[PDB]
């Protein structure tokens, strides 16, 4: 559906196509061939410094999915309840009305407190319960 080709469309239609937004995110139309006899020019330095910032934005979120059991797929749920105090709108309502665009501007605040809680109930509690529950 195109790179960010679902950003305009509502959350429901945005969750419908979000693989392309991660597909062309790394090696798409920016990777290229990457081809006086020296490569220490202004274009050589700029491409390698940008390469470091390229992986940094991917790995930051990649590590999080890995410590949530959501690493194996694009969309995976967790065993974390939603504290009503964060957002008071209906599940189905933001999906055809608010859109991911405004929605990120709503969570961004408690987003770090959400990430903190996501680590324990789904991994620090769920995967730590396995140690005893695996053999019975």
């Amino acid at each position: 559906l195109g790179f960010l080709g679902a950003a305009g469309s509502t959350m429901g239609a945005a969750s419908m196509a979000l693989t392309v937004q991660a597909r062309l995110l790394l090696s798409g139309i920016v990777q290229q061939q990457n081809n006086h006899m020296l490569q220490l020019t202004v274009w050589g330095i700029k491409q390698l410094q940008a390469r470091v910032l390229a992986v940094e934005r991917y790995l930051r979120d990649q590590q999080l999915l890995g410590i949530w059991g959501c690493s194996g797929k694009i969309i995976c749920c967790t065993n974390v309840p939603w504290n009503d105090s964060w957002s008071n709108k209906t599940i189905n309502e933001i999906w055809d009305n608010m859109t991911w665009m405004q929605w990120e501007k709503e969570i961004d605040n408690y987003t770090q407190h959400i990430y903190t809680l996501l680590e324990v109930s789904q991994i620090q509690q769920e995967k730590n319960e396995q140690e005893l529950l695996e053999l019975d």
């Epitope: 509502t10 309502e93 055809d96 009305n97």
Partner: nanobody, 127 residues
Framework: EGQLVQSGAELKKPGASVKISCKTS????????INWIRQTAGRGPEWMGW????????????????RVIMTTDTEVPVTSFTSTGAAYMEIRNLKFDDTGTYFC????????????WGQGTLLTVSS
């Protein structure tokens, strides 16, 4: 919660062409649909028609087809979400049964339905 500005106190004699306007403020006018309704003196509100400001789709009642023809303009963006637009309603060959209160309504997203209404335009179709 968004506020609507409904242009009022306009009325004329039967048979003549009536033009009713409404200014939209403090919301994304583009993806939000626009609904138009009227209520007679016999407490029976007749649903006039449904119009879309992003696409040319429309749904209108058979009693309001040849008589009623609606139009909409392009959105004027204020922020990355908020915009300003307007909708016009033209009615031809009016009767004393058409006399009543005419309202403009803001859309929802099961999306075709409204969410918020305007002040009200009391149309008096009298000679």
């Amino acid at each position: 919660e968004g506020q609507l500005v409904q242009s009022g106190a306009e009325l004329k004699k039967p048979g003549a062409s009536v033009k009713i306007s409404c200014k939209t403020s403090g919301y994304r006018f583009n993806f939000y649909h626009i609904n138009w309704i009227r209520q007679t003196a016999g407490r029976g509100p007749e649903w006039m028609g449904w119009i879309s400001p992003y696409s040319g789709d429309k749904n209108l009642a058979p009693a309001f087809q040849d008589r009623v023809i609606m139009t909409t303009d392009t959105e004027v963006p204020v922020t990355s979400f908020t915009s300003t637009g307007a909708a016009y309603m033209e009615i031809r060959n009016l009767k004393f049964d058409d006399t009543g209160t005419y309202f403009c309504a803001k859309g929802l997203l099961s999306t075709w339905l409204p969410y918020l209404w305007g002040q009200g335009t009391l149309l008096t179709v009298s000679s």
